[PDB]
Design a protein around this ligand. Sequence first.
Ligand SMILES: [Zn+2]
Length: 340
Amino acid sequence: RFVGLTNLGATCYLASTIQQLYMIPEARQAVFTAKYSEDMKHKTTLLELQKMFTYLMESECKAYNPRPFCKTYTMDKQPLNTGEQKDMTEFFTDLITKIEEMSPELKNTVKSLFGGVITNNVVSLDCEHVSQTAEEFYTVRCQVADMKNIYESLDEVTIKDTLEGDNMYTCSHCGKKVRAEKRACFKKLPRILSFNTMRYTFNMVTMMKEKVNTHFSFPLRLDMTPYTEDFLMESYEYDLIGVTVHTGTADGGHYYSFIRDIVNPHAYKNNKWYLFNDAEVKPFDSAQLASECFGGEMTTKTFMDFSFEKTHSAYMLFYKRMEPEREYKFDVSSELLEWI
Ligand SMILES: [Zn+2]
């Protein structure tokens, strides 16, 4: 049905990343049909990702052992350590950027599928000059602390701040100190929008990072129009297709994934979801997304109620752009079909 990925030690973050990539048809097919070139920058990683995807699609087993892929993977220091819990957002961004660097073809596919452009504007209120700079992204960081839902988070990402009094902007054109309005807006949005729902605050008394477990909701249907460049200064509506959940603390936490099957049509109409948790994959009742992903308090019996905040909650949200109008053909190379 669906194949898991064996945890090699502390590789929760890898399994969540590869499975969500695998379940995005456009990404699965671009990996299978990738064009190799003799002097390409991540050649072995490509082959091992092709094999992983091939194994996930065609293996009769229950789990792939991603050890060959890890042993070819380099992030900052040369090897990828099997027993260190990497940040999932960082790994997702690292992999996607590797794929982008493989070839011009893949860079174009990746920038369209996962990439977007933020514009940072500053509008002077005391001269005619404007400044605007572009910022590319693959994920959008969304503050969860003191926010009730992802719209309030995006209101904060997109907040118009005015530089005044002591914080006066210096216009580079006329060299004057000026009041100005500074604002971030989305100029281009990817087909697959990824949000890192960030629950960590720096307690600068402990000098440590602490997880926020308050309630934070997000909808199945999201309208990005009010955050777009046109609105502030192709469809903008999205459907939720996956949630990477983090449970525990920053230190000793773990990741697992609720993912929608958008590959299988006569099952996509039935809104079938699955829980991908290392080597174990099983169907998920998506009516339970709020319970499993929104955080906030729950109660249990101790006889009296005992109340605590859930330590499991959304870590990354995956949204797919709505398209007005398939059964997918994946072209695994003949040689890989031989291997599997
Ligand atoms: Zn000026």
